[PDB]
Amino acid sequence: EFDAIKIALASPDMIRSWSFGEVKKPETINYRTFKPERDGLFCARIFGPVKDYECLCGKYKRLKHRGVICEKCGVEVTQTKVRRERMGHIELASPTAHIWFLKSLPSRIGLLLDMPLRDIERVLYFESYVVIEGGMTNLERQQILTEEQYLDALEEFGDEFDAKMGAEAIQALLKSMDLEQECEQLREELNETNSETKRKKLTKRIKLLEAFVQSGNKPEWMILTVLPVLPPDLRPLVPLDGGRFATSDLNDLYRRVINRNNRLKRLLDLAAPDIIVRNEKRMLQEAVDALLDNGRRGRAITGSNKRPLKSLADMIKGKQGRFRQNLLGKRVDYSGRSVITVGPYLRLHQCGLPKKMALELFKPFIYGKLELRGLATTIKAAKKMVEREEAVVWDILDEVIREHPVLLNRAPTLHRLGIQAFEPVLIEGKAIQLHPLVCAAYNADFDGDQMAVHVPLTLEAQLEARALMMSTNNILSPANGEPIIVPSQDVVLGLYYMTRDCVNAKGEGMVLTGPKEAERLYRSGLASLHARVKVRITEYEKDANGELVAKTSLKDTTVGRAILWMIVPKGLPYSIVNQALGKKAISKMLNTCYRILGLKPTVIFADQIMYTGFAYAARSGASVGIDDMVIPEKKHEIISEAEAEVAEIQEQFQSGLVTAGERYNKVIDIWAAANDRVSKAMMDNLQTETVINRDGQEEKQVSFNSIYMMADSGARGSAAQIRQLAGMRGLMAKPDGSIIETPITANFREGLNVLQYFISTHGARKGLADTALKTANSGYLTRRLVDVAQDLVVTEDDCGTHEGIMMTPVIEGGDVKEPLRDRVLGRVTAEDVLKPGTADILVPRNTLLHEQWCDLLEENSVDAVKVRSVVSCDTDFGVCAHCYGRDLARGHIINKGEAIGVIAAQSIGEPGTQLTMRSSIQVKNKGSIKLSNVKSVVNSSGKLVITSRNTELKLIDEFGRTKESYKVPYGAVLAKGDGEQVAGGETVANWDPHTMPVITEVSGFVRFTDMIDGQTITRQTDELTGLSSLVVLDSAERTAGGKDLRPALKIVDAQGNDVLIPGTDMPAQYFLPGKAIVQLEDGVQISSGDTLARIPQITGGLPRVADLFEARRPKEPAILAEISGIVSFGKETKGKRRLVITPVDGSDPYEEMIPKWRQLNVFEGERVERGDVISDGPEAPHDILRLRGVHAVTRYIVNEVQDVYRLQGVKINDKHIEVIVRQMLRKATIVNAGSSDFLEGEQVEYSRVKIANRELEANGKVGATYSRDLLGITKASLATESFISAASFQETTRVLTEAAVAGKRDELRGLKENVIVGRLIPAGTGYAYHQDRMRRR
Amino acid sequence: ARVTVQDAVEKIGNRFDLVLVAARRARQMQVGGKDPLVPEENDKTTVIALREIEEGLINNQILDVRERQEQQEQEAAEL
Amino acid sequence: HARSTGSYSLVTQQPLGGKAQFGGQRFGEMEVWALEAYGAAYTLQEMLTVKSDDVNGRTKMYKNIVDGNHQMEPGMPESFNVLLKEIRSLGINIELED
DNA sequence: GGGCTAATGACGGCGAATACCC
DNA sequence: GGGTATTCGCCGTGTACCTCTCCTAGCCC
RNA sequence: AGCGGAGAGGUA
Ligand SMILES: [Mg+2]
Ligand SMILES: [Zn+2]
Ligand SMILES: [Zn+2]
């Protein structure tokens, strides 16, 4: 019906056009008769018919008189729904300022007038005056005066010069302001002001003006003269339980405004003195400002029971406004709620469903099919039949629910598997039966969880349900390629009991022709379930073109593995079922079944796993008992020596020979070692508990103790929990946050005593509090993430470019912790893979890297792979297909449309419920040593030391990839160097953390240049040796009288001449900073690699992830150098200690004040590149954007937050984080406009400016030079060209007002506003629809 | 019966236009007076529609042929 | 608890909340995002237009089910039009284009 | 009895509004 | 006057559901 | 057809 939405300020002409009458009287209801009044808030003659097609006087009770108004009380007879849209108005007596434009912070009126908000508050509250139409006065136009200054002006310029008060005066100012003259005068002052602050205020001023005149606005329109009133049905007046009416806050508000208005007009006729009507207008302004936005004035007014009433800003904002409560999430018919229970007999493409829920949900279907079969004439006969519950309509329902899928939902709907479709099978009972595998996707145990059902009505919705949301489709998470159909807990117990092997039981070593004789043995009770048997098996391999080759053999296996082998379909090798099959093994079993055989045998294979899993977990009978948990007998002695050791250290503290910190550290260490000794005792005495005779003497083997099988299966719990059952548990923390020196020496099988249980109670309560407040963060995180991606539809097939990022497997400093074939897997290459047969092309430049190509990358040891990423994808308004790669739930390239923004943000934010909340270099393995960006010298002894901080120590393997990586500090004593073979287990470096060495470069003499005892350096005799050394003071400790000197050391020869830097013609003098102690005294002929002086010396929870996507500037930012060239220092503590940067070729106007708490990296003789490190601390994201580029900052994000999730071990494939980063840096600014139309210091989105200069590329003219910005997620959300989505997100007032003075118009191009306006989403099927609709226009 | 829509995707590589082709076809079988082009099992219109997508005798192109050709029947009967 | 079609609320033509009032379930915001995560558009488009808000469209729907047609006619969410009259009931001119 | 009516126990954060310092 | 620097007011703070009560007083008639 | 706001407890 309609395209884009435009919004603007309200003309009073538009207000009167909207309205249908001036509401005049504050009484609404008669409440004696139930009619409302003549012209009250509920008005029949303004708003329309109370009842259906009747006048209020009751004249035209017939439909024939439709359209004509009456004369008795003048009510236009129409539908009663016409009382729903007809608005009203009020002619106010006084002009009245709107409160949003007054106090939006920044105020629109305030910077519109170049006037502080303090004074404008004073004007609107009648405690100052203001000049209008100055002329021949000593009084400026914006000059505000007090009452006594108004007396002085009343004497002095009390002639034809004018001055007023209130909103009439603000109406006069906005009435008399010219626009172009201040555009010229303030662009003129953007020329004339060198001041950055005036440049910023005046460019915000110039945006308000040049956007205001371009918009369809007028400045005096902000002062509301004619107040529009809401239609009455939207603000209804319901009866409560009795003859009273439940109050609306609206009708109280308008009741006050109409009281105060009518009393004001009566005060205008009677002409009271100015102070009374001053108070009356002041109470009117308080009334209207209360009605628009209550509470933005410093105290609200209360309606009843001492409670702040609900304005219209509270009809929009907040968790209970229309966007949160009635627009984005709507209550829906055709739905139901019930407790779930199991019902294991179902297949996974069906779920259980009770009968009475079905008969209540499917009533229109039953009605239609009763009309089809003619067993019912009318709607009331059919309705009485389904009220009657006849035995015919159960057959009708069994017809209509033959193939009718339903959409089940669970209430914390975190990631996209929360609604899945099923098919019902009707159930005697009252609870939903639900297939067990799906429980692991729903995060839904059966402790009392309640799931809701919805029903797709229309036919397209049924096809969307069965095609997409059917549970057979969703087998792989969008987070990772892992199966989400993992057999969770009983079925794996049935397998880990099934595929096990003991050495001596029934039927050892016999021979059987196949698995059918195995199951015939086990059902006979003639052979053991787990006793090792050679059988004959026959398997099939699809090495040919889908052709399954047969082979047979006589494997060594067990009986239960054969009975398992009858289920496994043809395409699998037998080694998938020849091991013990814990949880990981059955998981990768299903995954290989999907990668090899496709979808249908994988699904029905998983069903047969589940049914046989409960059959043999049932028949097995794995119980649990008090005899099953085994105390190690050696526990008591390790307790005894533990008490002996803390007895000895306690004795050492008795006379005071150890410190309290030493006692604390020593005691916690010996308890930790004791705890792990007990853990090895119980873990061995569980895992090899069984010793049985083999038909010979004996043998030990793995144990049939049930709690070990529940552990080693991986069904429930870990070695830490089963440690806590048998061995002693833990060192529980304290409420302070520290650890407690007396560990709980007893377990759960013995009793806890009292105080141990008290401390463990603290551990549990801190845990549960962390769960509640943790989720209280997590929902807000996923909330923001989907409200910043939100928009991002895979809309093209290729960008046709060759940028990208470089995937290397991460090496944190030890082992490789995420390998290459997980980060690379399933993404499209930037250019071809240059094999290290170098100039060999392993894969081409656009090929999707599935598992075969990744194996070919794996065999040829491919080091670094550049790859097309979404962050560098050159798609306009979207993401191309060949820059995204795999869906990760469909084993091919992404289809055009499935909006990876939302699946990204849910798949990122979902495991946040599972996060947490609150020397030298010793190499490991044997390979070659590679150094990165080295500037080094070999010392006097032959060890290598490095004069560059930024040199990185890599251990390359035997082949050529990197397998270790390390940081080598400034002046660090290496043991080896580049191209040198180190042994597996070598200390290959050294440095001192309590020394910043000032090491030499060549040899010669050392003169203490500008080192004067008392001014730069001070005399301190060393107390412990005797060879004293002069201490270089720092900046603030010396006085200013000798502070302007710089102490240095210049390498000089036997003549005093300049011994220069090797390669350049600069001497190697070192300007000494503070806390340097030159040990080597004057005139020492020095060597290489010796210290010229010694300069001595967090949270990764969910708020780490939050502040990463928020991108906060952290506490002590590691500052960087903006540009290359040599550097030096500047003025001593003018606030901070200044820097002096100097490039070689370019100019050097850039220098920057430096906080002197930072031990810098650079020196006066040290030259850097642009964006090089200057100090220590975290690496703040903005400067990483604007210096090192885009790829560095997205790489820093994905490795950072990938480390955060990676520590707790929950996999998120990186593309989701990458695409949220793509939404972060969508906005940009301008360096030079060129032939475009933008202001230079203006912010605009990168897509619109890239198509702006890209179409200025269509002419020969040069477009703009852009500069990208990095916003946080909560600010990049609000700074979006669609304002309506930003209204649906936070700070609704600021979004709407900036939209209003912006005059903003919204072509909508997105998702959430289309959920708002209620049309098809341009996401999937509706993306084909907007292909149609955008294709037509 | 119905378990997957795998092979329907194997003949229509979008998995979204599966829904529009299927909705167009099954809408042409529920409202319009046309028989199924496959033997049914007293199934619904949905599984009959996707089931006809399984045998590949319907995609978007054949539906263009029938809307155009039955459309020309609506031209030729107009005279 | 279940509900085919019962009473509708007053200020918004939407299903009521709860069980003692014979009301539907809240198809909340997060699973609107989850429908966005699938390609399901027509599912969603009947979730929050036909089955939820527009009174004309669900009369048409109720007639079409009892006749044997499965088709939706969207119209417009009533509640969005209520929001339009609310923002319009402040000092804000907000319209729709052609 | 009743018709009708005229507070103090958050916390983080973030951009304007003084403060003050040279 | 600029140039930080504090500070000072506003926005925010989990998802559905279930159960219950309790819903103006002043007041001069 | 006649169901809006507080406040309290609980459910996963
Ligand atoms: Mg639960
Ligand atoms: Zn009348
Ligand atoms: Zn691309």
Q: List Cα–Cα distances, A135 to A130, A142, A160, in angstroms.
A: 14, 12, 10
User: Cα separation of A913 and A911, whole Å?
Assistant: 5
Core vs surface per residue A1193-1229: b (16+ CB within 10 A) or e: bbbbbbbbbbebbbeeeeebbbbbbbbbbbbbbbbbb
Indicate whether C9 belongs to any domain: no
User: Cα separation of A276 and A1088, whole Å?
Assistant: 92
* A330 and C CB contact within 8 Å: yes
Q: List Cα–Cα distances, C53 to A589, A672, C50, C56, in angstroms.
A: 47, 63, 6, 9
Smallest CA-to-CA distance from A1234 within A1205, A1218, A1254, A1209 is with A1254
The count of domains in chain C is: 1
* Resolution attained, angstroms: 4.1
Contact A452, A942 (CB under 8 A): no
DSSP letter string, A362-384 = THHHHHHHHHHHTS--SHHHHHH
A428 phi/psi in degrees, rounded to 5: -65, 110
User: Cα separation of A476 and A843, whole Å?
Assistant: 27
Smallest CA-to-CA distance from A385 within C24, C62, A373 is with A373
A669: domain CATH number? 1.10.132.30
User: Cα separation of C36 and C50, whole Å?
Assistant: 18
DSSP letter string, A848-862 = B--HHHHHHHHHTT-
Contact B4, A600 (CB under 8 A): yes
Adjacent-strand bridge partners of A1268 = A1228
Q: Other C-beta atoms within 10 Å of A1092: how many?
A: 20
Chains linked to B by 3 or more Cβ pairs within 8 Å: A, C
Indicate whether C2 belongs to any domain: no
User: Cα separation of A474 and A477, whole Å?
Assistant: 7
Q: Looking at chain C, how many residues does it have?
A: 98
Tokens encoding A913: 């419920």
A530 phi/psi in degrees, rounded to 5: -130, 85
Contacts by A1259-1262, CB closer than 8 A, 24 or more apart = A1261/A1234, A1261/A1235, A1262/A1234, A1262/A1235
Contact C76, C13 (CB under 8 A): no
Which structural domain, as residue segments, surrounds residue B30?
1-74
Maximum Cα–Cα distance across chain A: 127
Indicate whether B19 belongs to any domain: yes
Cα Rg, chain C, nearest whole Å: 15
User: Cα separation of A1120 and A1123, whole Å?
Assistant: 9
* A462 and B CB contact within 8 Å: yes
Contacts of B15 in chain C (CB under 8 A): 39
Which structural domain, as residue segments, surrounds residue A699?
626-774
Adjacent-strand bridge partners of A1017 = A1013, A1032
HEC string of A1098-1124 equals: CCCCHHHHHHHHHCCCCCCCCCEECCC
| Amino acid code (one letter) for A1056 | G
> Vertex A635, ends A634 and A638: CA angle to 5°?
90
A951: domain CATH number? 2.40.50.100
DSSP category for residue A1030: P
Best of C13, C44, C95 to substitute, by most chain A Cβ atoms within 10 angstroms, is C44
Distance (Å) from the alpha carbon of A4 to chain C's nearest alpha carbon: 6
Q: Other C-beta atoms within 10 Å of C18: how many?
A: 10
User: Cα separation of A407 and B4, whole Å?
Assistant: 17
Residue in chain C closest to A1330 (alpha carbons) equals C41
Tokens encoding A934: 């080295």
Place of tokens 């009718």: A404
Indicate whether B79 belongs to any domain: no
Going through A1010-1124 in order, the beta strands assigned E by DSSP cover 1017-1018, 1031-1032, 1048-1052, 1070-1071, 1076-1077, 1120-1121
* C21 and A CB contact within 8 Å: no
Ligand nearest to the CA of A881: 3
Size of interface B-C (CB pairs under 8 A): 12
Contact A466, C45 (CB under 8 A): no
Adjacent-strand bridge partners of A739 = A733
**Interacting residues of A125 by C-beta distance below 8 A, sequence separation 6+:** A282, A285
Question: Which C residues between 10 and 29 have a beta carbon under 7 A from any strand F atom?
Answer: 10-11, 16, 20-21
Place of tokens 């004619």: A226
Contact A142, A128 (CB under 8 A): no
Contacts of A1323 in chain B (CB under 8 A): none
Tokens encoding A998: 């000032």
Contact A1038, A1015 (CB under 8 A): yes
- Among residues 30-89 of chain C, which lie with CB inside 8 Å of chain A? 30-54, 58, 61-62, 65-68, 70-72, 74, 76-77, 79-83, 85-89
Please compute, for residue A268, the number of CA atoms within 13 A of its CA located in the half-sphere on the CB side.
9
Smallest CA-to-CA distance from A782 within A910, A670, A696, A619 is with A910
Nearest to B17 among A464, A472, A1328 (CB): A1328
Contact C27, A331 (CB under 8 A): yes
DSSP letter string, A27-42 = --B-SSSS-B-SSSSS
User: Cα separation of A252 and A28, whole Å?
Assistant: 11
The count of domains in chain B is: 1
Nearest to C69 among B16, B19, B31 (CB): B31
User: Cα separation of A226 and C91, whole Å?
Assistant: 9
- Among residues 955-984 of chain A, which lie with CB inside 8 Å of chain C? none
CA dihedral (B45, B48, B50, B55) in degrees, to 10, reads -160
Contact A237, A70 (CB under 8 A): no
DSSP letter string, A472-505 = TT--B-SS-SSBS----SHHHHHHHHHS--BSSS
Cα Rg, chain B, nearest whole Å: 13
User: Cα separation of C25 and C2, whole Å?
Assistant: 8
- Measure A795 CA to E29 C1' (Å): 76
Peptide bond into A1103 cis (omega under 30): no
- Cβ of A1110 near strand D (under 7 Å)? The reply is yes
- Cβ of C29 near strand E (under 7 Å)? The reply is yes
Tokens encoding A746: 């007893």
Indicate whether C6 belongs to any domain: no
User: Cα separation of A1287 and A1277, whole Å?
Assistant: 10
* A315 and C CB contact within 8 Å: yes
Which structural domain, as residue segments, surrounds residue C40?
14-98
* B33 and C CB contact within 8 Å: no
Q: List Cα–Cα distances, A997 to A357, A972, A1018, A1061, A1128, in angstroms.
A: 79, 8, 19, 18, 19
A1080 phi/psi in degrees, rounded to 5: -75, 120
Q: List Cα–Cα distances, A615 to A490, A560, A704, A805, A1007, in angstroms.
A: 10, 12, 19, 51, 89
* C69 and B CB contact within 8 Å: yes
User: Cα separation of A574 and A552, whole Å?
Assistant: 11
Contact A614, A345 (CB under 8 A): no
User: Cα separation of A291 and A297, whole Å?
Assistant: 11
- Measure C45 CA to F2 C1' (Å): 29
Contact B43 A402 (CB under 8 A): yes
DSSP category for residue A987: B
Smallest CA-to-CA distance from A1211 within A861, A825, A938, A949 is with A825
User: Cα separation of A502 and A693, whole Å?
Assistant: 11
Contact A173, A143 (CB under 8 A): no
Which residue intervals of A810-867 are DSSP H helices?
A: 820-823, 851-859
**3-class secondary structure, C85:** helix
Smallest CA-to-CA distance from A900 within A380, A1320, A1311 is with A1311
DSSP letter string, A48-97 = --SSTT--SS----SGGGTT-B-SSS--B-S-GGGGTT-EEEEEEEEEEE
Place of tokens 């600010």: A1275
Experimental method: cryo-EM
Maximum Cα–Cα distance across chain B: 48
B49: domain CATH number? 3.90.940.10
Indicate whether B14 belongs to any domain: yes
Contacts of C37 in chain B (CB under 8 A): none
Strand E, nucleotides < 7 Å from a protein CB: these are 1-5, 10-20, 23-24
- Cβ of A1099 near strand D (under 7 Å)? The reply is no
Strands A335-341 and A432-433: parallel
Strand D, nucleotides < 7 Å from a protein CB: these are 4-5, 7, 13-18
User: Cα separation of A892 and B29, whole Å?
Assistant: 32
User: Cα separation of A463 and A692, whole Å?
Assistant: 60
